[PDB]
A paper describes a structure:
Gene-deletion and transgenic studies in mice established that Grb10 and Grb14 are tissue-specific, negative regulators of insulin action. Previous structural and biochemical studies of Grb14 established that: (i) the BPS region inhibits the catalytic activity of the insulin receptor by binding as a pseudosubstrate in the kinase active site; (ii) the SH2 domain binds directly to the phosphorylated activation loop of the insulin receptor kinase domain; and (iii) functional RA and PH domains are required for negative regulation of the insulin receptor. The small GTPases N-Ras, H-Ras, and K-Ras serve as molecular switches in cellular growth control, cycling between a GDP-bound inactive state and a GTP-bound active state, and gain-of-function mutations in the Ras proteins are found in approximately 30% of human cancers. To understand the molecular basis for the interaction of Grb14 with activated Ras, we determined the crystal structure of the Grb14 RA and PH domains in complex with activated H-Ras and measured the in vitro binding affinity of this interaction.
We determined the crystal structure of a complex between Grb14 RA-PH (Grb14RA-PH) and a constitutively active mutant (G12V) of H-Ras loaded with Mg-GTP. The four copies of Grb14RA-PH-Ras in the asymmetric unit are highly similar and superimpose on one another with a root-mean-square deviation (rmsd) of <1 Å (410 Cα atoms). As first observed in the Grb10RA-PH structure, and more recently in the RIAM and lamellipodin RA-PH structures, the RA and PH domains of Grb14, together with the intervening linker of ~40 residues, share an extensive interaction interface, which creates an integrated two-domain structural unit. Despite low sequence identity (<20%), the Grb14 RA domain adopts the same ubiquitin-like fold of the RA domains (RBDs) of RalGDS and Raf1, consisting of a five-stranded β sheet and two α helices. The PH domain adopts the canonical PH-domain fold, comprising a seven-stranded β sheet and a C-terminal α helix. Grb14RA-PH interacts with GTP-loaded H-Ras (G12V) exclusively via the RA domain, with the β1-β2 loop of the PH domain free to bind to the headgroup of membrane phosphoinositides. A common feature of RA-domain binding to activated Ras is backbone hydrogen-bonding between β2 of the RA domain and β2 in the switch 1 region of Ras. Specifically, Lys111 (β1) of Grb14RA-PH is salt-bridged to Glu37 (switch 1) of Ras, Arg120 (β2) is salt-bridged to Asp38 (switch 1), Asp123 (β2) is hydrogen-bonded to Tyr64 (switch 2), and Lys140 (α1) is salt-bridged to Asp33 (switch 1). A small hydrophobic cluster is formed between residues Val109 (β1) and Ala121 (β2) of Grb14RA-PH and Ile36 (switch 1), Tyr64 (switch 2), and Met67 (switch 2) of Ras. Mg-GTP is bound canonically to Ras in the Grb14RA-PH-Ras structure.
Numbering used by the authors:
A (entry chain B): -4 to 166
B (entry chain A): 106 to 211, 219 to 356
Write the structure that this text describes.
């Protein structure tokens, strides 16, 4: 028939336990919100999308926040092209953990220029423990974008993932 | 005693599970039914998929998944898949006419059923198959006999005389695989291939490759071989879908 060119992007969603990594991923892929909490070890997802006039396959790796499984981190970090770095905006502990992720990726891949988006999730809540400007800084400090999201409302989900792809593409 | 395993779907996505070392195929399926918000059909199945040789098999309910993984070479890149399989226990549903008229010998439904599941006697399954003679790339059409003690072919037409019988394979320490949609054209007459792979706890694990005339002929063979290998356990699995 006809040959069809397509570019693949390996995205990895990282961050502490319960920040909303899977809810965001499932929202992107499956267009619905998971209210239940279902501990992830490592789950893989695929989606064809058109980004900036180009056909892309996004291979999305949704990873463990559980430290018990930190040995697996090195393999998915070598393999990953872009990293969605997620903390929750009502959980300061999560915001401190993302420093360590950024650093582990920086080291594992051996580069100061890894495509990344810092994602402040659960933006639909009233009980903020991390202010937008606080994270705006750490993003500027890394040179990466900052997007606030809600898996529950769908706010900024597409924004966050498509931005990472654009980060990959421009690097 | 735990192992992290990865289970794939048809779309080639996957989910990791950390599971106890004594976990059965049934228990992994049920875990995955619950996690994926599926409805238990009894057709959900774990498959052992060997990508480098183009074959797969159903993992029987009671098998220990970690024992299945242990028989893998580490360079093999083998995979576990999870999907529905409707044919699995077809013999158990519609026994008396499952096997064609000419193929078996020892008509009542539970008659044939009881004869297939006994630990003493086995029936005999006989018919033509194509076999890749060992080391060579060519294939021959030959008459075969499946018995309690294993699989044989005749060096002279269809003759069952001990003079003409040649041992082909054991199934105590081999597993049965069916080919996917890969290149048959490593000589094979049809796409209806199946093969036996020895456990690594034997000697050299050389594939014994076979090939049927028709899809339905393969299913009967693979089914006969499965019943011979697992016997009554197969039936128990089916008759107690939840085991508890
Ligand atoms: N209010 C609100 N709750 C959310 C949001 N995203 C996720 N949650 C909830 O927080 C809990 C954990 O979300 P998950 O996506 O399962 O967390 P996770 O980061 O994937 O956890 P691990 O898989 O263990 O790393 C679930 O109950 C979600 O419903 C959000 O945007 N808003």
């Amino acid at each position: 028939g006809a040959m069809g060119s397509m570019t693949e992007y390996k995205l990895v969603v990282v961050g502490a336990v319960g920040v909303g990594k899977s809810a965001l991923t499932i929202q992107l892929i499956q267009n619905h919100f998971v209210d239940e909490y279902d501990p992830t070890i490592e789950d893989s997802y695929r989606k064809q999308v058109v980004i900036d006039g180009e056909t892309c396959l996004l291979d999305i790796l949704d990873t463990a926040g559980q430290e018990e499984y930190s040995a697996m981190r090195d393999q998915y970090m070598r393999t990953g092209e872009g990293f969605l770095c997620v903390f929750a905006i009502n959980n300061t502990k999560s915001f401190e953990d993302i420093h360590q992720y950024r650093e582990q990726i920086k080291r594992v891949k051996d580069s100061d220029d890894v495509p990344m988006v810092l994602v402040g999730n659960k933006c639909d809540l009233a009980a903020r423990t991390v202010e937008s400007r606080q994270a705006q800084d750490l993003a500027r400090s890394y040179g990466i974008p900052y997007i606030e999201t809600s898996a529950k409302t769908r706010q900024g989900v597409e924004d966050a993932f498509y931005t990472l792809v654009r980060e990959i593409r421009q690097h | 005693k735990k192992q992290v395993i990865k289970v794939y779907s048809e779309d080639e996505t996957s989910r990791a599970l950390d599971v106890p070392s004594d976990i059965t195929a049934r228990d992994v399926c049920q875990l995955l039914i619950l996690k994926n918000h599926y409805i238990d059909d009894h057709s959900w199945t774990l498959f052992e998929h060997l990508p480098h040789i183009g074959v797969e098999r159903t993992i029987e309910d009671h098998e220990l998944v970690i024992e299945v993984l242990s028989n893998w070479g580490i360079e093999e890149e083998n995979k576990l898949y999870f999907r529905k399989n409707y044919a699995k226990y077809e013999f158990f549903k519609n026994p008396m006419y499952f096997f064609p008229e000419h193929m078996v010998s020892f008509i009542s439904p539970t008659q044939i059923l009881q004869m297939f599941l006994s630990s003493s006697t086995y029936p005999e399954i006989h018919g033509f198959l194509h076999a890749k003679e060992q080391g060579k790339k060519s294939w021959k059409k030959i008459y075969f006999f499946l018995r309690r003690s294993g699989l044989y072919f005749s060096t002279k037409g269809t003759s069952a005389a001990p003079r003409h019988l040649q041992f082909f394979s054991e199934f105590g320490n081999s597993d049965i695989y069916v080919s996917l949609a890969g290149k048959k054209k490593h000589g094979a007459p049809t796409n209806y291939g199946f093969c036996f792979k020895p456990n690594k706890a034997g000697g050299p694990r050389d594939l014994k490759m076979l090939c049927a005339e028709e899809e339905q002929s393969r299913t009967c063979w693979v089914t006969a071989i499965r019943l011979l290998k697992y016997g009554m356990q197969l039936y128990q699995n089916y008759m107690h879908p939840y085991q508890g």
